């Protein structure tokens, strides 16, 4: 099978700047007929992949001129000029000269924006969950930038690592921020063995972590 390799794996780019994505194929994608069967797809978060450029450089319908493709043989480049917020997502190269058709692993375009501190909210288990025997403590960490963040759960001053389920969003198309949900799930018994619950967020926007807590 033809291997498709993309670099870089992720690409932060400021609004209005140009982005360049590289795709390398293990075999030449030039057919006997003269066409080069290399294509670029974009998959925005929550969406299906969409065709951007077919046969190296041809824009598919509805694709603006700020998107352009180039290259030959086994080396190709997608250039996004004047990057817009709405251009975030994962860019895939693909070949259709040989069966099986194969895809690159994707390159994620991240839009640089001003740093933003996470808005942090913590929630005790609902009465309803408690009745059923479960006890989840939920912490939302919303609209932050850059994406890297670290969340620590503390119970009575002690860090708990087990029972934690975290979910991270993709970058938001509208404001270029990120959000995160952290749930510490205990049983009703374990939760009632303790009173003090703390969600602790480490992010570049603050030298000391953001701390949200409650006492049971």
């Amino acid at each position: 099978d033809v291997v498709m390799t993309q670099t870089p794996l992720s690409l932060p780019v400021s609004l209005g700047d140009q982005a360049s994505i590289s795709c390398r194929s293990s075999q030449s994608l030039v057919h006997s007929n003269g066409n080069t069967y290399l294509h670029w797809f974009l998959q925005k978060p929550g969406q299906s992949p969409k065709l951007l450029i077919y046969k190296v450089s041809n824009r598919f319908s509805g694709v603006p001129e700020r998107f352009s493709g180039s290259g030959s043989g086994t080396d190709f480049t997608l250039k996004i000029s004047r990057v817009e917020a709405e251009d975030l997502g994962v860019y895939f190269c693909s070949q259709s000269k040989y069966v099986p058709y194969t895809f690159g692993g994707g390159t994620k375009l991240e839009i640089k924006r001003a740093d933003a501190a996470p808005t942090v909210s913590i929630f005790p288990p609902s009465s309803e969950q408690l009745t059923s025997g479960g006890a989840s403590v939920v912490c939302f960490l919303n609209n932050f930038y850059p994406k890297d963040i670290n969340v620590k759960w503390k119970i009575d001053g002690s860090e708990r690592q087990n029972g934690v389920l975290n979910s991270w969003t993709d970058q938001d198309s509208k404001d270029s921020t990120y959000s995160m949900s952290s749930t510490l799930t205990l049983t009703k018994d374990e939760y009632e063995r303790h009173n003090s619950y703390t969600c602790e967020a480490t992010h570049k926007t603050s030298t000391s972590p953001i701390v949200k807590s409650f006492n049971r």
Binding site: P49, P125, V138, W168, S181
Partner: protein
Amino acid sequence: VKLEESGGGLVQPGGSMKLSCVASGFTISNYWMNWVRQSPEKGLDWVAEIRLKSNNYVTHYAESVKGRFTISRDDSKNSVYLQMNNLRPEDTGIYYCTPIYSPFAYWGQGTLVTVSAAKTTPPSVYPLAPGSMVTLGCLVKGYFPEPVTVTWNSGSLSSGVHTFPAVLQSDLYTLSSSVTVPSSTWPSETVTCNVAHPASSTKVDKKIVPR
């Protein structure tokens, strides 16, 4: 102009499932039709192709699905199909159909195929109320399979909402959603999260009340 996939769902390993892909606003009879699947672990994975009546309906398959999957077309119904037999857990993923070398080379919204022995389980829906802006939430726990749909005030409340990607630990999914509104909005006005889990025929409304 659109492509619409259907036929997916939860199916036990060794099982069988038939996907449909129906086109609107154009005729598929003129274009090579492809199935492609997506998973977090493998990314985009080409599955099968069927060419034209004029190509003698020649087909091609990925090696991983040969002998098990069958791609077919019915131009008279403007549709392509994927019959899948002896399904494996690794066949799990979102399945798309697309015309290639075509003005109408769109992928549609896809159909989710879940191949697992795990049983269908309804979600528990728990309201998240606080102990200038106020953040409220809804915890949707212990369901299977995907998907669920979560909205707030039947979708009227869209700004300031974060619905997080479902997380699968073992055989149960957990999802949460948060909504942030001005302190003057709640609890003076109603804020209710609506959760739908078609697979278990579940619809739940949780009004967020103080305390």
